[PDB]
Swiss-Prot record:
Cu cation binds at H44. Disulfide bonds join C1-C24. This is Azurin. Its main location: periplasm. The gene is azu. Residues 1-125 form the Plastocyanin-like domain. GO terms for molecular function: copper ion binding; electron transfer activity; identical protein binding; transition metal ion binding; zinc ion binding. It comes from Pseudomonas aeruginosa (strain ATCC 15692 / DSM 22644 / CIP 104116 / JCM 14847 / LMG 12228 / 1C / PRS 101 / PAO1).
């Protein structure tokens, strides 16, 4: 009921498909950032929404800027998220699996780099 995920200096996560076992009550993502670039140059977060909500979350988050960790404050569309991290920093987020529904499509992404392809699927199994 946990996954370790890395975001690197070239705007890539080390996975693009996360599976959450449906028997898990909570799920945890441990985000880290190998590489050498600091947060105000190549910062990453990990953000979860429905596939439908992803674009809005990214557009509104980018507009919110670096000091808001590239996320719209109190965004109802964001199921779970970490803070923004630079190289050598780490952050974890845990969420209730009850927040995911069978039949729905979910995406994870880094909001500042989602447009550059830093995204993937999250699926219940
Ligand atoms: Cu990123």
């Amino acid at each position: 009921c946990s996954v370790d995920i890395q975001g690197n200096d070239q705007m890539q996560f080390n996975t693009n498909a996360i599976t959450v076992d449906k028997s898990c009550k909570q799920f945890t993502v441990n985000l880290s950032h190998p590489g050498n670039l600091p947060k105000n140059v190549m910062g990453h977060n990990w953000v979860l929404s429905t596939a439908a909500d992803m674009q809005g979350v990214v557009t509104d988050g980018m507009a919110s800027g670096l000091d808001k960790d590239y996320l719209k404050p109190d965004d109802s569309r964001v199921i779970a998220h970490t803070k923004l991290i630079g190289s050598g920093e780490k952050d974890s987020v845990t969420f209730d699996v009850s927040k995911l529904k069978e039949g729905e499509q979910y995406m994870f992404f880094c909001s500042p780099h989602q447009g550059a392809g830093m995204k993937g699927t999250l699926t219940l199994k």
